[PDB]
């Protein structure tokens, strides 16, 4: 004697049942080892990808969207700045970390940034990399950016700087000193910026991507 409870005879799309195999007693072709087997999406979001920081105007439709211009002549002047929201912000929109995030609703983990100065070896200078925490707005002057979390980056010695960000905030770069070059060396250089997930990184509630049409 059996009784059929409610929920019987329904096609609940998201359920895991045993399914009657159509073609049984059919061989499967043994699987060979293929180099590079993804098991978790996270392993993809741990790869640095260049960022179109300068997505201004018709730069997006050219290769000059990824490079940040750093001129010799002009102190307190600012290099760049963008809000630190890898999900909704247009800067981290199509980044490898950002695309993966657009498939989920909740996420918690550190973000790692890496700047690579792409200038002549003779070129020397200093930069102020300041990160303002969420509640505070972006700093206006150089002093205000110094009085928070900052990293004074000297291009002459180190050519690549790494910033690990906890817990959105802001990232601002300032010219501590103008670029100094001996004669026969160009003074107009560029900076590139890579983004990557760091330490713990979790993603919950799978949703559809908003980039389909």
């Amino acid at each position: 004697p059996t009784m059929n409870t409610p929920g019987s005879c329904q096609f609940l799309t998201s359920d895991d049942f045993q399914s009657p195999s159509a073609m049984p007693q059919y061989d499967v072709t043994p699987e060979m080892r293929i180099p590079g087997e993804v098991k978790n999406l996270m392993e993809i979001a741990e790869v640095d990808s260049v960022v179109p920081v300068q997505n201004v105007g018709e730069k997006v439709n050219s290769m000059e969207a990824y490079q940040i211009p750093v001129r010799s002549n002009e102190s307190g002047t600012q290099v760049f700045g963008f809000p630190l929201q890898p999900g909704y912000s247009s800067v981290f929109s199509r980044t490898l970390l950002g695309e993966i995030l657009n498939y989920y609703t909740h996420w918690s983990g550190s973000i790692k940034l890496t700047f690579m100065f792409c200038g002549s070896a003779m070129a020397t200078g200093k930069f102020l990399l300041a990160y303002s925490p969420p509640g505070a707005g972006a700093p206006t002057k150089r002093v205000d950016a110094m009085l928070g979390t900052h990293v004074v980056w000297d291009v002459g010695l180190q050519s690549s700087c790494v910033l690990c960000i906890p817990w959105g905030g802001f990232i601002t770069c300032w010219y501590q000193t103008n670029i100094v070059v001996p004669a026969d060396a160009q003074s107009s250089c560029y900076i590139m910026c890579f983004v990557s997930a760091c330490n713990d990184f979790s993603v919950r509630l799978l949703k559809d991507t908003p980039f389909i049409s």
Binding site: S19, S21, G36, V203, T209
Partner: protein, 218 residues
């Protein structure tokens, strides 16, 4: 714990829409199995170069009456047949053909008003993995289409009304659900930036890298 390729590629996704009538110009449905029609699933699968999986085909067949001027219509329960064609299998040229009786094609019979019919398909590829992106010509001597390897073939699906229910016309629809099972992936690749154009190939129209803003410092 949630972002595994299993939980990311094991969602039931509708992949087809079609209609067949008990009497009329169209009396049977046909759709070559492919995961390229649905863009939502195609873009998720194009994350990896080589992918291998099993299927769980689940159909949803609904029938509606038609605007006819015949009277004294008495309906009888409808029965639908869904013939799965293995690659290289005979394909019914017509509705009342003889191919609907081959013991090879595993057709599932269903009577309206029950739990929707579902069947599974194993890995049928002769090769060791379905290849999303092929960089060559299918024909050995060339003079063949580019990026069209036949190793990914998964067969065709055919559906018909075994018995006409009533003198009055009836039109039925069928939604095919795709559920990859026991999924494996290899060689991760970047997400498709531009929108899809033709399900046949990777042709696209050039697109900007991202949405623009006012100034770099903003």
């Amino acid at each position: 714990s949630e972002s595994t390729i299993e939980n990311f590629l094991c969602r039931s996704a509708c992949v087809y829409f079609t209609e067949y009538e008990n009497s009329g110009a169209k009396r049977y449905a046909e759709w070559v199995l492919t995961p390229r029609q649905a863009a939502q699933l195609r873009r998720k699968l194009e994350f990896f170069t080589y992918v291998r999986f099993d299927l769980e085909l689940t159909f949803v067949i609904t029938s509606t009456q038609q605007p006819s001027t015949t009277q004294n219509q008495d309906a009888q329960i409808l029965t639908h047949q869904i013939m799965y064609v293995p690659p290289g299998g005979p394909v019914p040229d017509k509705v009342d053909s003889y191919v609907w009786q081959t013991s090879t094609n595993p057709s599932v019979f269903w009577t309206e008003g029950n739990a929707p019919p579902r069947m599974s398909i194993p890995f049928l590829s002769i090769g060791n993995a379905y290849s999303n992106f092929y960089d060559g010509w299918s024909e050995f001597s060339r003079n063949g289409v580019y990026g069209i390897n036949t190793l990914n073939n998964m067969g065709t699906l055919y559906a018909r009304h075994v018995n006409a229910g009533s003198t009055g016309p009836i039109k039925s629809t069928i939604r095919i659900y795709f559920k990859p099972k026991h999924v494996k992936a290899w060689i991760p690749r970047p997400p498709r930036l531009c929108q899809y154009e033709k399900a046949k190939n990777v042709n696209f129209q050039p697109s900007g890298v991202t949405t623009t803003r006012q100034s770099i410092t903003t």
